[PDB]
């Protein structure tokens, strides 16, 4: 085993720690909130607030980054890059999760890992200067994951329903990226078996979804009406929201596949959200 170091242990950091420390790791998780101390205990790590004292890599063999950017880039680099690229040769693995929003928009086409990046927006473009100030960073066993739209226990859409206030935005043509956390969790796991010193992986389910499907199903599961549709050139969407509408892409997720031996135990979003709704692993 060895000592994973979680900068932002958030949502999918967790999953993975609860599955990683009763196999003997050690998991060291940061948060910058106070009140999420609690909560990253329970996930099997020691919790430390950052900013606040620097975190200390004495011992660790893992790196794992779940802190989104800015429009300087990568956070962890800013304040302990100089530490990191030192320490490169101690870890065994680094990995960096980053975002399907890199590529920008493909009108529907399909894209991989080779693809070239061309985001439309600033989110997606801080998340490509993150990644290549992580790739810059010599002789670092680093590792990039492009998560879809996660999902999950406690992050699903059946809390979402019941109380109004829900609508189905069209925008013909348009899909969605999705993963499910288990999923992520098997990828990070499957990586840190299988080290490749500067690889990136999509990590995504096989099935591009209109969002207004998955809406739609989980409305169709709860035995609730189809909740209305709006189009979306009427739907009078602040930015933000509308900025999601602005690329639409499909992305391969063979490598993690052949490369990493990784097996979907969510493979769509229909065996997802059944799954979901019974709180049940199948």
């Known amino acids: 085993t060895g000592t994973l170091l979680s900068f932002g242990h958030g949502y999918t950091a967790r999953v993975l720690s609860r599955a990683l420390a009763p196999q003997g790791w050690r998991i060291i998780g940061t948060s910058r909130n106070p009140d999420q101390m609690e909560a990253i205990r329970a996930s099997g790590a020691e919790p430390l607030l950052w900013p606040g004292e620097e975190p200390s890599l004495d011992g660790v063999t893992h790196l794992l980054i779940s802190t989104a950017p800015d429009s300087g880039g990568d956070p962890v680099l800013a304040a302990l890059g100089d530490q990191i690229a030192a320490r490169a040769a101690q870890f065994r693995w680094v990995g960096y999760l980053s975002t399907t929003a890199v590529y920008g928009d493909h009108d529907g086409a399909w894209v991989d890992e080779t693809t070239p990046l061309t985001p439309t927006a600033a989110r997606?473009?801080?998340?490509?200067?993150?990644?290549?100030?992580?790739?810059?960073?010599?002789?670092?066993?680093?590792?990039?994951?492009?998560?879809?739209?996660?999902?999950?226990?406690?992050?699903?859409?059946?809390?979402?329903?019941?109380?109004?206030?829900?609508?189905?935005?069209?925008?013909?043509?348009?899909?969605?990226?999705?993963?499910?956390?288990?999923?992520?969790?098997?990828?990070?796991?499957?990586?840190?078996?299988?080290?490749?010193?500067?690889?990136?992986?999509?990590?995504?389910?096989?099935?591009?979804?209109?969002?207004?499907?998955?809406?739609?199903?989980?409305?169709?599961?709860?035995?609730?009406?189809?909740?209305?549709?709006?189009?979306?050139?009427?739907?009078?969407?602040?930015?933000m929201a509308r900025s999601f509408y602005s690329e639409n892409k499909r992305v391969r997720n063979d490598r993690i596949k052949e490369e990493l031996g990784v097996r979907l135990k969510y493979?769509?979003?229909?065996?997802?959200?059944?799954?979901?709704?019974?709180?049940?692993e199948t």
């Open 124 to 239: 997606g473009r801080w998340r490509v200067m993150a990644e290549q100030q992580w790739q810059a960073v010599p002789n670092l066993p680093l590792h990039v994951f492009r998560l879809a739209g996660i999902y999950g226990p406690g992050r699903g859409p059946f809390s979402k329903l019941g109380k109004g206030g829900i609508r189905r935005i069209i925008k013909p043509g348009q899909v969605f990226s999705r993963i499910h956390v288990e999923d992520i969790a098997q990828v990070l796991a499957a990586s840190m078996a299988r080290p490749d010193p500067g690889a990136v992986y999509n990590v995504c389910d096989d099935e591009p979804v209109p969002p207004q499907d998955v809406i739609a199903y989980a409305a169709e599961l709860q035995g609730l009406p189809l909740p209305p549709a709006v189009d979306f050139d009427k739907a009078d969407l602040t930015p």
């Open 267 to 280: 493979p769509n979003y229909r065996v997802g959200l059944e799954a979901l709704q019974a709180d049940a």
